[PDB]
């Protein structure tokens, strides 16, 4: 292989490995923030579904 092909193949390899490395760092910082603040799709622990509540008039008024 001529030096140019190897040289520019290396830049293609370096770009992918650099892009992946940045994403890995972003993922770790995104995970840290989502877990601490609970404001994202991850670490979304379920709460009781409010469609289970019955809003009909009851046997007694004060409820």
């Amino acid at each position: 292989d001529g030096p140019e092909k190897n040289y520019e193949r290396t830049m293609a390899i370096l770009q992918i490995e650099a892009e992946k490395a940045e994403l890995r760092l972003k993922e770790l910082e995104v995970r840290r923030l989502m877990r601490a603040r609970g404001d994202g799709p991850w670490f979304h622990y379920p709460t009781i579904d409010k469609e289970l509540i019955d809003h009909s008039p009851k046997a007694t008024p004060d409820n």
Binding site: E19, L23, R24, D39, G40, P41, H44
Partner: protein
């Protein structure tokens, strides 16, 4: 001129007219917490795949 109600009459659900307005916040509920932002858009392939260690897919 009082007529005794027949069987079942007094258990009917009836409608009643009133002026008193319908209460707005009868439970005295606070403002509900804001929902988490919706995630929306076009689902695209993961960038460079799984990206787990050395895997290229």
């Amino acid at each position: 001129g009082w007529v005794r109600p027949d069987l079942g009459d007094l258990s009917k659900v009836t409608k009643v007219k009133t002026d008193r307005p319908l209460p707005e916040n009868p439970y005295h509920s606070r403002a509900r917490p804001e929902p988490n932002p919706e995630v929306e858009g076009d689902l695209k392939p993961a960038r460079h795949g799984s990206r787990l260690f050395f895997w290229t897919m």
